[PDB]
């Protein structure tokens, strides 16, 4: 539970996780480091990609790479919509398995996704590339 | 809108912001870098602290330091509750001004806070230290 953030200077803040790591947020439109809102977008991408690769490895599917293209829109400033586009690379991965993994990840397993869903329109999509 | 995440190895993912910066997320309980859920907690702290220090500087208040103690609980895994505790340091800052700033920040200006609120119980609190 012990996370903290500290004002460094300007609008730069230091962020310390309870897993013992530190990061930097920059409130000048992410000038020198990501803005908090960028943190959120990336965390959604990351949490999702984690679960997607996990499901495939458990299902013995030979997943070799995973990339997430994130797009979003926001009020002129809350996010109105985030799209997670998965690019899954592997050997014999079947469509049904990738759909399952992207599905369960985005709507059942990804905490970040599920928290945002109650306030943001979150959509997903995927493609499969041979290695 | 152009953020992305890339699988590096293990459960380590690279995250790239459209402001042109990169970070690392680690899905092994934030082993080597923060977990996505830690990203979210810190972004809420950061977005909040940003707005808090901004309001005070606009109101000509001599804010010298700002720290946020974050605590949270989560299902045994969504966050059920996040508490933002602000520690504002300054010279002649008045209580009414700090309350205002923490208030507007947490319930009107902080996008990250406001997105989470629809799914998580978010509470705030503050204290004021002389410099």
From Swiss-Prot, chains A, B:
- Gene3D superfamilies reported in the protein's UniProt record: 2.20.25.10, 3.30.300.20
In terms of Pfam families, this protein maps to: OsmC
Instruction: Specify the protein name.
Output: Protein YhfA
Q: Which gene encodes it?
A: yhfA
Q: Which cysteines are joined by disulfide bonds?
A: none
User: Domain of life here?
Assistant: Bacteria
Q: InterPro entries in the record, alphabetically?
A: KH_dom-like_a/b (IPR015946), OsmC/Ohr_fam (IPR003718), OsmC/Ohrsf (IPR036102)
């Amino acid at each position: 539970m012990q996370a903290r953030v500290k004002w460094v200077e300007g609008l730069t803040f230091l962020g310390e996780s309870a897993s013992g790591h530190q990061i930097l947020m920059d409130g000048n439109s992410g000038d020198k480091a990501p803005s908090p809102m960028e943190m959120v977008l990336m965390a959604a991408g990351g949490c999702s990609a984690i679960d997607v690769v996990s499901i495939l490895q458990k299902g013995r599917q030979d997943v070799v790479d995973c990339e997430v293209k994130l797009t979003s829109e926001r009020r002129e400033r809350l996010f109105t919509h985030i799209n997670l586009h998965f690019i899954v690379t592997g050997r014999d991965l079947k469509d049904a398995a990738v759909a399952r993994a992207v599905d369960l990840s985005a709507e059942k397993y990804c905490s970040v996704a599920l928290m945002l869903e109650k306030a943001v329109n979150i959509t997903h999509s995927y493609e499969v590339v041979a290695a």
